[PDB]
Design an enzyme around this catalytic site. Structure first.
Site, PDB file in Angstrom:
ATOM      1  N   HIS A 117       0.988  -1.253   0.020  1.00 15.18           N
ATOM      2  CA  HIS A 117      -0.096  -0.032   0.103  1.00 15.18           C
ATOM      3  C   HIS A 117       0.948   1.370   0.074  1.00 15.18           C
ATOM      4  CE1 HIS A 117      -2.375  -3.016   2.475  1.00 15.18           C
ATOM      5  NE2 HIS A 117      -2.674  -3.211   1.281  1.00 15.18           N
TER       6      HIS A 117
ATOM      7  N   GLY B  12       1.289   3.324   2.119  1.00 17.85           N
ATOM      8  CA  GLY B  12       2.287   3.190   3.521  1.00 17.85           C
ATOM      9  C   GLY B  12       3.602   2.560   3.190  1.00 17.85           C
ATOM     10  N   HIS B  13       3.638   1.401   2.625  1.00 21.98           N
ATOM     11  CA  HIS B  13       5.132   0.642   2.179  1.00 21.98           C
ATOM     12  C   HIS B  13       6.109   1.569   1.445  1.00 21.98           C
ATOM     13  CE1 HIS B  13       2.209  -2.712   3.226  1.00 21.98           C
ATOM     14  NE2 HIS B  13       3.407  -3.111   3.837  1.00 21.98           N
TER      15      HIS B  13
ATOM     16  N   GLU C 206       8.557   1.588  11.831  1.00 22.95           N
ATOM     17  CA  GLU C 206       8.654   1.682  13.343  1.00 22.95           C
ATOM     18  C   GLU C 206       7.148   1.377  14.129  1.00 22.95           C
ATOM     19  OE1 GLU C 206       9.593   5.928  14.382  1.00 22.95           O
ATOM     20  OE2 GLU C 206      11.621   5.706  13.545  1.00 22.95           O
TER      21      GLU C 206
HETATM   22  C1  PAF Z   1       5.346   1.126   6.712  1.00 22.20           C
HETATM   23  C2  PAF Z   1       4.517  -0.213   6.994  1.00 22.20           C
HETATM   24  C3  PAF Z   1       3.281  -0.288   6.034  1.00 22.20           C
HETATM   25  C4  PAF Z   1       5.391  -1.252   7.157  1.00 22.20           C
HETATM   26  O1  PAF Z   1       4.570  -2.613   7.768  1.00 22.20           O
HETATM   27  C5  PAF Z   1       3.944   0.097   8.469  1.00 22.20           C
HETATM   28  O2  PAF Z   1       5.194   0.424   9.345  1.00 22.20           O
HETATM   29  C6  PAF Z   1       3.212   1.409   8.422  1.00 22.20           C
HETATM   30  O3  PAF Z   1       1.766   1.496   8.552  1.00 22.20           O
HETATM   31  O4  PAF Z   1       3.898   2.554   9.097  1.00 22.20           O
END
Ligand code: PAF
Ligand code: PAF
Ligand code: PAF
Lengths: 165, 167
Positions: free
Chosen positions: A34, A36-37, A139
Site C-alpha cells: 500500500h 504506506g510501504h 517503526e
Molecule cells: C510502513 C508499514 C506499512 C510497514 O509495515 C507500517 O510500518 C506502517 O503502516 O507504517
C-alpha cells in the site's frame, strides 16, 4: 525494474551490483503493498544507489495456516507500484526456494530479550542473500524493529537498520 | 600479518578488503594451533587471495566453566605459526568484545534436521561469517558433526560462502 524469483539469479545480480560499487538498500515486505510501504521505499532511495524490495509471505512467522493462506497475494500489483516508485529490483522467491525442506527442520535464528523466530530467521536469510548496506523497516511494529536492531547488533551484520516513522 | 582485536577495527579491515574486491578465506579456530590447523591454513592460502584466521575460545559452546577455563591459550605460539604461513589477518577478540551483553541473552542460531555445544558453534560461526564476509571458509573433517552442522547452516541460511572440509 528487474524481477528476480530464484537464488542463483539474485546472487548474480548482487555480485554485479557489488562489482559496480553500488550502495544497496533492502526493503523487506510480504507483498500486498500500500501507499504506506512507499515510505520505506522512499527512505531507501534517498539512502542508497539501488533499492531492492523483497516480497515473500513467510510461513515461519504465521501462527495459523489459515492466516498464511489468506494473506493477500498481489504480485503483479505490488510490482506495478514499485516500478512506479523507481525501485531497481524486486526479489520474489517461492516458499521452497527459501525453505527447501520445510520450516520445521530449517535452521532458525532466535533473539532472546513462533512469530518472532520466523521474523529473525527470514530477515537474517534475506540479509545473507541480498547483502545490503542498509535495510528499512517500519517503526509501527516496534517489537519487530527492536528485534531486528538487536539481531544485527548481536550477529555482526554490517547493515545500517533504518526505522521509518 | 595484522592482529585485530576489536569489531570496529575488523569492520575497517573487511570493508577495505570488500572494496578492493579480494577473495577472502576464513579459518575459524579457538587457538592452540597445531599441525591440523596448519593444513586448514594452507588450504585457505591456496584457495583465496587473502586469509583471515579467527582465534576465539567461544564460551557459548562449552557447557562447564571448568572446560572453558582449561582450554589452552597459546596466542604467541599461534601467531608464530600463522605468521610463518603468511596469514594476512588474525582476528583475536575478547569475550566481552564478542558478547558485550553476555552469552545468555545473545541472539543464537540453531540448526535442526553437551546440550548447547552445537548451538554455541552455529551461533559463533554465523557471527564470524557476518563479521568477516569471507568467500570461503575451511573446517576440519575430523569433527564431522560440526562440518555437517556448518554445511546445513550455510545452505539453509543463504550464506554465499563456500565451505571446504579438509582432512
Ligand atoms: C510502513 C508499514 C506499512 C510497514 O509495515 C507500517 O510500518 C506502517 O503502516 O507504517
Ligand atoms: C519484515 C517482514 C517482511 C519479514 O517477513 C515482515 O515481518 C513484515 O511484513 O513486517
Ligand atoms: C569452529 C569453531 C572455531 C567455532 O568456535 C570451533 O568449534 C572449532 O575450533 O572447531
Amino acid at each position: 525494474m528487474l524481477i528476480i524469483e530464484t537464488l542463483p539469479l539474485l546472487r548474480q545480480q548482487i555480485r554485479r551490483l557489488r562489482m559496480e560499487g553500488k550502495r544497496v538498500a533492502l526493503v523487506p515486505t510480504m507483498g500486498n503493498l500500500h501507499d504506506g510501504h512507499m515510505k520505506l521505499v522512499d527512505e531507501a532511495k534517498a539512502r542508497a544507489d539501488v533499492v531492492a524490495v523483497s516480497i515473500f509471505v513467510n510461513p515461519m512467522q504465521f501462527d495459523r495456516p489459515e492466516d498464511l493462506a489468506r494473506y493477500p497475494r498481489t504480485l503483479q500489483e505490488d510490482c506495478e507500484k514499485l516500478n512506479k516508485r523507481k525501485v531497481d529490483l524486486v526479489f520474489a522467491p517461492s516458499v521452497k526456494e527459501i525453505y527447501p525442506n520445510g520450516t520445521e527442520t530449517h535452521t532458525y535464528v532466535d533473539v532472546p530479550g513462533g512469530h518472532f523466530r520466523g521474523v529473525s530467521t527470514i530477515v537474517s536469510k534475506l540479509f545473507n542473500l541480498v547483502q545490503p548496506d542498509i535495510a528499512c523497516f517500519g517503526e509501527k511494529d516496534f517489537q519487530q524493529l527492536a528485534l531486528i536492531r538487536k539481531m544485527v547488533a548481536d550477529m555482526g551484520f554490517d547493515i545500517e537498520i533504518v526505522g521509518v516513522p
